[PDB]
Design a protein around this nucleic acid. Structure first.
Lengths: 136, 94, 141, 38, 73
RNA sequence: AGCCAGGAUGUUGGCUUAGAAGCAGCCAUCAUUUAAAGAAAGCGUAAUAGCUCACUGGUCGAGUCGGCCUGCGCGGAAGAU
């Protein structure tokens, strides 16, 4: 799974997840998967989403991943009272905003591109959509 | 060869613009020349239906306003984030 | 001359008048007593030489009399030896062997004419130069 | 019958109808394709 | 005939040709000895007891990759 | 969309030909008219035949097919006096 090699700190404050997103246009290939909801994506769902749609074309075309987990979400161990320090980091998420370009790919025909993204979307906890590169 | 129906908008602002796009119409701006810019309002539905063509971005766009029709070019499209609509277009008066 | 119930459209070898592996299914299906049928087969079998495949149509009348209108080499099997080799395919676009002319095939289209009268002399030759394409053979004149 | 909360038209002849308010899919050819509740 | 042959092919059988006499449809084929095991128990299970067969030897022909790898103990 | 005529198939086309006969799937993707016909999806099947499907030849005679953006509803929905 995807994870930051050598980041500065061990833990990070929780932080609200407001506003909109910056990645909006299908900037690399031709067919992308823009997100419509507002949540967060851990690395395991990041790995699983690509895997399902990589084998949907089985080799075909280039596939770009536009989101990377930065936020080191922690969890406390069970039967441990509150306080006593911040818990250890268990998994890494990437906070998703509305109108964010997720997984993007190229080199595939359109009808199976919408099919491959449909196989990927059901693995996501965010409602997404299939978007296409416009000019400019 | 596309033609645009439009008119001059008044009383602009943040909430004013938000009031527009919840009424199937959206604002814009026309600038470029030895004159003042023109904050022009134009129909949302019509131009969104025709932005799919490549000639919407590679042609001297014929926007008519108060009878006076001008030839402009499309600079940028500030579109809506996740809804398939759009928020603003910049028309440089070429 | 009935319908398709007893109508079998296949055969391979003239000289081998005995039920061959592909004519097996065909024969057994309609209980064809090939032995006396071989004597009727060998009236026209002797007119053609061996080495070029021959099909047959089979017609069984209502009163157990069963007859046939046999053939001469049709579309595929004649164009193959015209190229010199019976096979060499599985890769039409991926292989390129030989170049054959249509004027020489205009003569053998007339031999297919008395055999399997396929429409429009050159357009059947075009139908069958695609069987050459399907056999991985190039054709140019 | 499969009580599947999602129903997909699994074939060509599989038709989707609303019996008693409940969405039901039936098939003329394959009785394994019968399902409801979607 | 078709059923017997489908099952011949199934038991790695070479259906070859479909001959015919008067009341019977005779089909001769080549079958491995390893898949001969209990054949007439499976023959008349598919032919309502109205069929028969007789096994003869031809040759120790080729054993394919799945059949060659099996018996190696 | 149906109803009758049908399916306009050269080509049993290679191949692997034991058959893969559009109907194993790799492939050429040729061509016949250029009024109804892809060298082909699908169960069915050993393989043809097959009924169909794509397409309606003509019968009737009017509106119709599927997505898009959304308003409000259904199902998803099982707990203990």
């Amino acid at each position: 799974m995807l994870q930051p090699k050598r980041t500065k700190f061990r833990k990070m404050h929780k932080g609200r997840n407001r506003g909109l997103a910056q990645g909006t246009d299908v900037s690399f290939g031709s067919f992308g998967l823009k997100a419509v909801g507002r949540g967060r994506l851990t690395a395991r769902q990041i790995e699983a989403a690509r895997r399902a749609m990589t084998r949907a074309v089985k080799r075909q075309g280039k596939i770009w991943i536009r989101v990377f987990p930065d936020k080191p979400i922690t969890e406390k161990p069970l039967a441990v009272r509150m306080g006593k320090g911040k818990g250890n980091v268990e998994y890494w998420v990437a906070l998703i905003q509305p109108g964010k370009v997720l997984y993007e790919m190229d080199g595939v025909p359109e009808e199976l591109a919408r099919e491959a993204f449909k196989l990927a979307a059901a693995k996501l906890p965010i409602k997404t959509t299939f978007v296409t590169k416009t000019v400019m | 060869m596309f033609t645009i129906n439009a008119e001059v908008r008044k009383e602009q602002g943040k909430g004013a613009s938000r009031r527009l796009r919840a009424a199937n119409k959206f604002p814009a701006i026309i600038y470029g020349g030895k004159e003042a810019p023109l904050a022009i309002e134009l129909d949302h539905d019509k131009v969104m239906n025709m932005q799919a063509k490549a000639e919407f971005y590679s042609e001297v766009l014929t926007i008519v306003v108060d009878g006076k029709e001008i030839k402009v070019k499309a600079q940028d499209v500030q579109r809506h984030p996740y809804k398939p609509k759009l928020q603003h277009i910049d028309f440089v008066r070429a | 001359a009935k319908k398709v119930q007893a109508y079998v459209k296949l055969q391979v070898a003239a000289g081998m008048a005995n039920p061959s592996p592909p004519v097996g299914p065909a024969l057994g299906q309609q209980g064809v007593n090939i032995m006396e049928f071989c004597k009727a087969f060998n009236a026209k079998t002797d007119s053609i030489e061996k080495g070029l495949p021959i099909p047959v149509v089979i017609t069984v009348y209502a009163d157990r009399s069963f007859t046939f209108v046999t053939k001469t080499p049709p579309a595929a099997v004649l164009l193959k030896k015209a190229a010199g080799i019976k096979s060499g395919s599985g890769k039409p676009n991926k292989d390129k062997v030989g170049k054959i002319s249509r004027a020489q095939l205009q003569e053998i289209a007339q031999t297919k004419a008395a055999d399997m009268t396929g429409a429009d002399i050159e357009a059947m030759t075009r139908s069958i130069e695609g069987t050459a394409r399907s056999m991985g053979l190039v054709v140019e004149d | 019958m499969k009580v599947r909360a999602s129903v997909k038209k699994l074939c060509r002849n599989c038709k989707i109808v609303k019996r008693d308010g409940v969405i039901r899919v039936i098939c003329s050819a394959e009785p394994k394709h019968k399902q409801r509740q979607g | 005939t078709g059923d017997v042959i489908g099952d011949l092919s199934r038991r790695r059988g070479m259906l070859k040709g479909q001959e015919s006499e008067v009341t019977g449809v005779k089909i001769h084929a080549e079958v491995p000895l390893s898949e001969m095991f209990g054949y007439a128990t499976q023959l008349r299970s598919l032919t309502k007891g109205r069929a028969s067969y007789t096994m003869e030897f031809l040759k120790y022909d080729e054993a394919p990759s799945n059949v060659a790898q099996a018996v190696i103990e």
